[PDB]
Design a protein around this ligand. Structure first.
Ligand SMILES: [Zn+2]
Ligand SMILES: [Zn+2]
Length: 80
């Protein structure tokens, strides 16, 4: 599937209740702090073409931390 509703804002349908800057998947805001806040040092592991619209996934940290970050969600420079 191409795109209908985000609210991940990227990975690409799952939502809820708007925290920081984006529309997030709740899974995403969880992911966002999970990597950023406590458990990231990363270039991307899978590869940085690790794909999320909804054909996809192919999901990892840096890749779509940074694509979810295109809609600069704040788990930001967290908490660093
Ligand atoms: Zn998501
Ligand atoms: Zn990846």
């Amino acid at each position: 599937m191409p795109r209908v509703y985000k609210p991940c804002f990227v990975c690409q349908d799952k939502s809820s209740g708007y925290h920081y800057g984006v529309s997030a998947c709740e899974g995403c805001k969880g992911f966002f702090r999970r990597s950023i806040q406590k458990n990231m040092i990363y270039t991307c592991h899978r590869d940085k073409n690790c794909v999320i619209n909804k054909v996809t996934r192919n999901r990892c940290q840096y890749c779509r931390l940074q694509k979810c970050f295109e809609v600069g969600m704040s788990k930001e420079s967290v908490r660093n």
